[PDB]
RNA sequence: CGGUCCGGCCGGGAACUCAAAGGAGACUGCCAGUGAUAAACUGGAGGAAGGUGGGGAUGACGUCAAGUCAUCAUGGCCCUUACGACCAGGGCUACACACGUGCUACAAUGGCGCAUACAAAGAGAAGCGACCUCGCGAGAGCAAGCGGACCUCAUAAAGUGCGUCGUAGUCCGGAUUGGAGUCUGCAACUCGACUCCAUGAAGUCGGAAUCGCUAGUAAUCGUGGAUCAGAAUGCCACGGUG
């Protein structure tokens, strides 16, 4: 069968599929390198496979929409680590100390009437 | 085959006068592809709250417009004759055609 | 907002349709690539107030021509003054 | 610089510009038609353009053609 | 390396050197070098004279340098001579094209003192 | 800071090294929220430096950074109609951060070409302590040890 | 001024909507004028009819309008007449056909609008404002009313300086969303000014 | 999974993303420490979320005879063949200046050229307007779909890859002016916005003084909307990187 695990981060939604095969990655029907596996998050995608050996052990096919570079990136990171419950909840405990388990609840702060943007306050006159 | 888009400003009223229809289908007729939600259109308006000056003022309003889909598959003279005249619940736009 | 200046807009809104959209239609095809007989952009000497771009848009209830809104046909004041009393269906103070 | 497909002038003024040919010129013509593009058929006239308070006399010249009458009728009395 | 106008420019890419002319912006300067079999960025360090005069004549077509400045100052003077509004503006050292004068008219007005 | 004391958030390590310090550095240099380019500028300078010293890579930074590193600074007091500006002992955590900021901010004021070149040339300049940055040391150490009577 | 409208704030919950139909951008406005035009004619014809609150829904190319009055008999009239005459006009105003109900007002001293309007007819009638507020509040807590406050202001009794004089009694938490709060306004056109009346009535919990 | 014109496109599938209704969940509750054995605070565990989790809405009695008779309403006062009313043209866009708020820059953390990867939120029938065609261009001709998770407004820009420039008043910067055009509008002189060609100020980091922001913020990059025939560097809103 398959081992699913959604996972998301800031407007981004990334679904991960885990099957035991090889250290290749099928993100949006293209290579890890064919997307952003070298940019401002070269390997935040590989991370979930740090203390949980890989190299060529298990293979994974991933889709993702919304957000931008590092957002989709982190999203996937999370989704992987969640689909990675497959082996057991025995590893999803030191994966915690890695922080990969936590949904980064940080969102774009809204703009607010009276301000130039979110927090930024229209400079006011001397006195 | 028979598709009805529902809309109104009260959610816990639209899905109610919707379940009226779904049940009134899977009682008489049959099939029906459930109550599909769809996306809500929220048109917001923001206006100044002071009659003179003060722009930091302002009040922010919105009008949420919720939808439902319906979609009944077996047009049975009995169910198609059930929808009609047993419609009620005003303040709900219903559309059957295209 | 000053009766007179109000009736003016009614006369304008009337003219807008007595003539324009009607006999004014003859300028769309009349005065564009259909080639010239000049009496074309000439007959454009009708009332004056006879034109949509000459209407203003006034708070349907007061007349205040500022702070207006297309959805409701009113200006921010009376719009809120009504919104806070039901009056405007579906409309309530939002947040997010 | 604007009009594209056909220059513009007011009718009343145009009439004042034709009538003032086969009946010879005369004193200043008075229009408020600061909106009109000058025609060659105006040259050697005396058309007086309203500028807010009054109508200034303007002598249609060899090549004041593609311009408007309002151009020669300053309105703000600066200084 | 004067060419068409007495200006003697070089030591950079051709497309860019050509811009010294008082009458060629990127566009003209494109239609120029691209109308000779010359390249975008070939310096003058390789461009033999006989490869330069095929240019000199390509630029001989459109008014530039002296003749241009003349033409323009002329048009302006024409404005003034009429007595319109753009004219009264050129003559009155103020912004022609409508810009506010209540403030910020410094380019057409000159640094302030009073 | 008036009531609710804290600590300080911490950051992922250097994506291309694994160090906290360096990442801190890139942030220090980053701007307009440009990480992609910032790090590209940092590594290139640490690279040209790297070879130009031959002296390893990791500690090419460490050494030159050990020169800017301060020991004492000054906190203004303004007590009674007088500024009475007292010297204080800088903590071993800020120290490094300041040195980093004087380096970055120094190369920033250099008249070279690439910010990478400017950087490297400041870095190596400090390796032989004679830069702007090191002078900032030979400045804050001047200010204290003078007001040092305010211990 | 720093108070949020106690009615409009509750709308989402615990409070209805005196206009409850649905329309699209296209004629939402043309409908709004109609709406706040028939209340215009209606609160004029039935002012002595102790009208508390008119309501409107537009059931598909048609309009309903339920009039909440405290003296329904007088609005209904002899065998339907008083509502009959209304049918017509209202229908020739909205542009469509029009039913028209008449919800009774169970105990009117609990209706903010009718309390206020009373306190107004009083001032116009030339009674001591203090007395009016007092009575209102009293014989309002008389029959339930977890809380209440009336506040009438401006040229009270007829001074050159303007006052506000309020009178709270019982419990009134404007800050609680889930609380039932009826609030209203009524202008008094006094023979020398215009005194503003506002009233809050607190009816309870969830 | 099955058909394949590599398109979720045809069955179909109802898992998943998502959509929107109803729910659960976090409470100092537990472990420990400090603390008067209390309140709390600190740290830890689990946990998507720890100590109001993030952001909103919500603004007490009152203060300044603060602001609004021009939104509306209204006591009083005043003109009423005029302070009312219709029309045309102009002015609200003036310019020796001074102040506030902002936009755009002085540049290689970039300018330019080509290729190219990832959003969010919204608007739309007197409307949004594909495609194709014509123009270097703004646009124009002909014309489908869509009253809208279907169609269109849109083709994100920072970014990333290569090539160029090598610190120059420059290949930055774009003011100002000349010439010629487009569109909306009865009409663009006063006074529209945009495009094509040329034109290239001041500016190389800003005295005294002074403002904003404590986390997905500041900084920075683009997107949409309201008013609107047609004038956004403003306003309201949206997400990128951080
Ligand atoms: Mg009036
Ligand atoms: Mg208009
Ligand atoms: Mg509260
Ligand atoms: Mg006051
Ligand atoms: Mg440039
Ligand atoms: Mg704070």
From Swiss-Prot, chain B:
Any one Gene Ontology molecular-function term assigned to this protein's record: transcription antitermination factor activity, RNA binding
Q: What Gene Ontology cellular component terms go with this record? A: cytoplasm; cytosol; cytosolic small ribosomal subunit; small ribosomal subunit; transcription elongation factor complex
Q: State any GO BP term from the record.
A: cytoplasmic translation
At the top level, the lineage of the source is Bacteria
| Subunit structure as annotated in this protein's UniProt entry | Part of the 30S ribosomal subunit. Can also form a heterodimer with the transcription antitermination protein NusB. Binding of S10 to NusB is mutually exclusive with its incorporation into the ribosome. The rRNA transcription and antitermination complex (rrnTAC) consists of RNAP, NusA, NusB, NusE (this protein), NusG, SubB, ribosomal protein S4, DNA and precursor rRNA; S4 is more flexible than other subunits.
Name the UniProt record assigns to this protein: Small ribosomal subunit protein uS10
Its keywords, alphabetically, are:
Ribonucleoprotein, Ribosomal protein, Ribosome biogenesis, RNA-binding, Transcription, Transcription antitermination, Transcription regulation
The family database entries (PROSITE patterns) matched by this protein are listed as:
RIBOSOMAL_S10 (PS00361)
> What HAMAP family would the database entry show?
Ribosomal_uS10
Matching entries from NCBIfam families are given as: PRK00596.1, rpsJ_bact
Keyword field contains Iron: no
Q: Which family does it belong to?
A: Belongs to the universal ribosomal protein uS10 family.
Swiss-Prot record, chain C:
Q: Which UniProt keyword terms apply here? A: Ribonucleoprotein, Ribosomal protein
State the GO CC annotations: cytoplasm; cytosolic small ribosomal subunit; small ribosomal subunit
List the SUPFAM superfamilies hit by this protein, alphabetically.
Glucocorticoid receptor-like (DNA-binding domain)
The protein's job, in short, is:
Binds 16S rRNA, required for the assembly of 30S particles and may also be responsible for determining the conformation of the 16S rRNA at the A site.
| Listed GO biological process terms | cytoplasmic translation; ribosomal small subunit assembly; translation
Q: Which GO terms describe its molecular function?
A: rRNA binding; structural constituent of ribosome; tRNA binding
Checking HAMAP family in the record gives: Ribosomal_uS14_1
Q: Which NCBIfam families match?
A: PRK08881.1 (NF006477)
The UniProt family comment states: Belongs to the universal ribosomal protein uS14 family.
Q: Which Pfam families match?
A: Ribosomal_S14
Whether Ribosomal protein counts among this entry's keywords is yes
Record keyword Ribonucleoprotein present: yes
What name has this protein been given in UniProt?
Small ribosomal subunit protein uS14
Q: What does the subunit comment say? A: Part of the 30S ribosomal subunit. Contacts proteins S3 and S10.
InterPro entries named in the record: Ribosomal_uS14 (IPR001209), Ribosomal_uS14_bac/plastid (IPR023036), Ribosomal_uS14_CS (IPR018271)
Q: Which species is the source of this protein? A: Escherichia coli (strain K12)
Curated annotation (Swiss-Prot), chain E:
Determine the domain of life of the protein's source: Bacteria
Give the Pfam families listed for this entry: Ribosomal_S13
Instruction: Extract the signal peptide range.
Output: none
Record-level GO cellular component terms? cytoplasm; cytosol; cytosolic small ribosomal subunit; small ribosomal subunit
Q: Which Gene3D superfamilies match?
A: 1.10.8.50, 30s ribosomal protein s13, domain 2 (4.10.910.10)
Tell me which UniProt keywords the record has, alphabetically: Ribonucleoprotein, Ribosomal protein, RNA-binding, rRNA-binding, tRNA-binding
**Region spans: Disordered:** 93-114
Single GO molecular function: structural constituent of ribosome
Q: Which GO terms describe its biological process?
A: cytoplasmic translation
**How is the quaternary structure described?**
Part of the 30S ribosomal subunit. Forms a loose heterodimer with protein S19. Cross-links to the P site tRNA and weakly to the A site tRNA. Forms two bridges to the 50S subunit in the 70S ribosome, contacting the 16S rRNA and proteins S19 and L5.
Q: Which NCBIfam families match?
A: uS13_bact
- Similarity comment: family membership: Belongs to the universal ribosomal protein uS13 family.
Designated name of the protein: Small ribosomal subunit protein uS13
From Swiss-Prot, chain G:
Organism (species): Escherichia coli (strain K12)
InterPro entries, sorted:
KH_dom (IPR004087), KH_dom-like_a/b (IPR015946), KH_dom_type_2 (IPR004044), KH_sf_prok-type (IPR009019), Ribosomal_S3_C_sf (IPR036419), Ribosomal_uS3_bac-typ (IPR005704), Ribosomal_uS3_C (IPR001351), Ribosomal_uS3_CS (IPR018280)
UniProt entry tagged with the keyword Ribosomal protein: yes
Functionally, this protein is described as follows: Binds the lower part of the 30S subunit head. Binds mRNA in the 70S ribosome, positioning it for translation.
Entry annotated with the keyword Aminoacyl-tRNA synthetase: no
KH type-2 domain span: 38-106
Question: What is its quaternary makeup?
Answer: Part of the 30S ribosomal subunit. Forms a tight complex with proteins uS10 and uS14. With proteins uS4 and uS5 encircles the mRNA as it enters the ribosome, which may play a role in mRNA helicase processivity. Some nascent polypeptide chains are able to cross-link to this protein in situ. In collided ribosomes contacts ribosome rescue factor SmrB.
- GO biological process per UniProt: cytoplasmic translation; ribosomal small subunit assembly
Protein name, per record: Small ribosomal subunit protein uS3
Molecular function (Gene Ontology), one example: mRNA binding
Under SUPFAM superfamilies, the record lists:
Prokaryotic type KH domain (KH-domain type II), Ribosomal protein S3 C-terminal domain
- Keywords from the named record: Ribonucleoprotein, Ribosomal protein, RNA-binding, rRNA-binding
Q: Name one GO cellular component term.
A: cytosolic small ribosomal subunit
Q: Which family does it belong to?
A: Belongs to the universal ribosomal protein uS3 family.
């Amino acid at each position: 069968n398959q081992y699913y695990g959604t996972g998301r981060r800031k407007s981004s939604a990334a679904r991960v599929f885990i099957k035991p095969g090889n250290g290749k990655i099928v993100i949006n029907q293209r290579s890890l390198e064919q997307y952003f596996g070298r940019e401002t998050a070269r390997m935040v995608v590989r991370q979930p496979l740090e203390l949980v050996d890989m190299v060529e052990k298990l293979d994974l096919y991933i889709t993702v929409k919304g957000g931008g570079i590092s957002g989709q990136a982190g999203a996937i990171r999370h989704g992987i680590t969640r689909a990675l419950m497959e082996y057991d909840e025995s590893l999803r405990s030191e994966l915690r100390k890695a922080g990969f388990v936590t949904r980064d609840a940080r969102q774009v702060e809204r703009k607010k009437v009276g301000l130039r943007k979110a927090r930024r306050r229209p400079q006011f006159s001397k006195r | 085959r028979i598709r009805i888009r529902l809309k109104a400003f009260d959610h816990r009223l639209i899905d109610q006068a919707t379940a009226e229809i779904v049940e009134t289908a899977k009682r008489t007729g049959a099939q029906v592809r459930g109550p599909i939600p769809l996306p809500t259109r929220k048109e917001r308006f923001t206006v100044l709250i002071s009659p003179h000056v003060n722009k930091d003022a302002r009040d922010q309003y919105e009008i949420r417009t919720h939808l439902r889909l319906v979609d009944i598959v077996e047009p049975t003279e009995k169910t198609v004759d059930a929808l009609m005249r047993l419609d009620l619940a005003a303040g709900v736009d219903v559309q059957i055609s295209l | 907002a000053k009766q007179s200046m109000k009736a003016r807009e009614v006369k304008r809104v009337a003219l807008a349709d007595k003539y324009f959209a009607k006999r004014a239609e003859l300028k769309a095809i009349i005065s564009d690539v259909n080639a010239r007989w000049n009496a074309v952009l000439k007959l454009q000497t009708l009332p004056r107030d006879s034109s949509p771009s000459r209407q203003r848009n006034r708070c349907r209830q007061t007349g205040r021509p500022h702070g207006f809104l297309r959805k409701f046909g009113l200006s921010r004041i009376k719009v809120r003054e009504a919104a806070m009393r039901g009056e405007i269906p579906g409309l309530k103070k939002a947040s997010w | 610089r604007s009009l594209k497909k056909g220059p513009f002038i007011d009718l009343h003024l145009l009439k004042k510009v034709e009538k003032a040919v086969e009946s010879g010129d005369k004193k200043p013509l008075r229009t408020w038609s600061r909106r009109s593009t000058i025609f060659p058929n105006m040259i050697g006239l005396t058309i007086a353009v309203h500028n807010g308070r009054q109508h200034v006399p303007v002598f249609v010249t060899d090549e004041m053609v593609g311009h408007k009458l309002g151009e020669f009728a300053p309105t703000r009395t600066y200084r | 390396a004067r060419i068409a106008g007495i200006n003697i420019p070089d030591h950079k890419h051709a497309v860019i050197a050509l811009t010294s002319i008082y009458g060629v912006g990127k566009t003209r300067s494109k239609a120029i070098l691209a109308a000779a079999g010359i390249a975008e960025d070939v310096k003058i360090s390789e461009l033999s004279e006989g490869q330069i005069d095929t240019l000199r004549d390509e630029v001989a077509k459109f008014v530039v340098e002296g003749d241009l400045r003349r033409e323009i100052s002329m048009s302006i003077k024409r404005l003034m001579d009429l007595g319109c509004y753009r004219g009264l503006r050129h003559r009155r050292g103020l912004p022609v094209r409508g810009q506010r004068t209540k403030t910020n008219a410094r380019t057409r007005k000159g640094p302030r003192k009073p | 800071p008036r009531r609710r004391v804290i600590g300080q958030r911490k950051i992922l390590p250097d994506p291309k090294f694994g160090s906290e310090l360096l990442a801190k550095f890139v942030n220090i240099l980053m701007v307009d929220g440009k990480k992609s380019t910032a790090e590209s500028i940092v590594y290139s300078a640490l690279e040209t430096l790297a070879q130009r010293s031959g002296k390893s890579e990791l500690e090419a930074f460490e050494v030159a950074l050990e020169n800017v590193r301060p020991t004492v600074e000054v906190k203004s007091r303004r007590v009674g109609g007088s500024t009475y500006q007292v010297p204080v002992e800088v903590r071993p955590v800020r120290r490094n951060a300041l040195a980093m900021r004087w380096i970055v901010e120094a190369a920033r004021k250099r008249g070279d070409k690439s910010m990478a070149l400017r950087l490297a040339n400041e870095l190596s300049d400090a390796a032989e302590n004679k830069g702007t940055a090191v002078k900032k040391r030979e400045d804050v150490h001047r200010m204290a040890e003078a007001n040092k009577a305010f211990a | 001024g720093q108070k949020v409208h106690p009615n409009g704030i509750r709308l989402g919950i615990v409070k209805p909507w005196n206009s409850t139909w649905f329309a699209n951008t296209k004629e939402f406005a043309d409908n709004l004028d109609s709406d706040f035009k028939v209340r215009q004619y209606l609160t004029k014809e039935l002012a002595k009819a102790s009208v508390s609150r008119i309501v409107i829904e537009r059931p598909a190319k048609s309009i309903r309008v339920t009039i909440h009055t405290a003296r329904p008999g007088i609005v209904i009239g002899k065998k339907g007449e008083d509502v009959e005459k209304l049918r017509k006009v209202v229908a020739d105003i909205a542009g469509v056909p029009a039913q028209i109900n008449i919800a009774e007002v169970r105990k009117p001293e609990l209706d903010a609008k009718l309390v206020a309007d009373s306190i107004t007819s009083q001032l116009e009638r030339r009674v001591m404002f203090r007395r009016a507020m007092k009575r209102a509040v009293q014989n309002a807590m008389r029959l339930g009313a977890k809380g209440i406050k009336v506040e009438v202001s401006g040229r009270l009794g007829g001074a050159e300086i303007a006052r506000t004089e309020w009178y709270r009694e019982g419990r009134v938490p404007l800050h609680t969303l889930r609380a039932d709060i009826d609030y209203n306004t009524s202008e008094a056109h006094t023979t020398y000014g215009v005194i503003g009346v506002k009233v809050w009535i607190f009816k309870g919990e969830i």
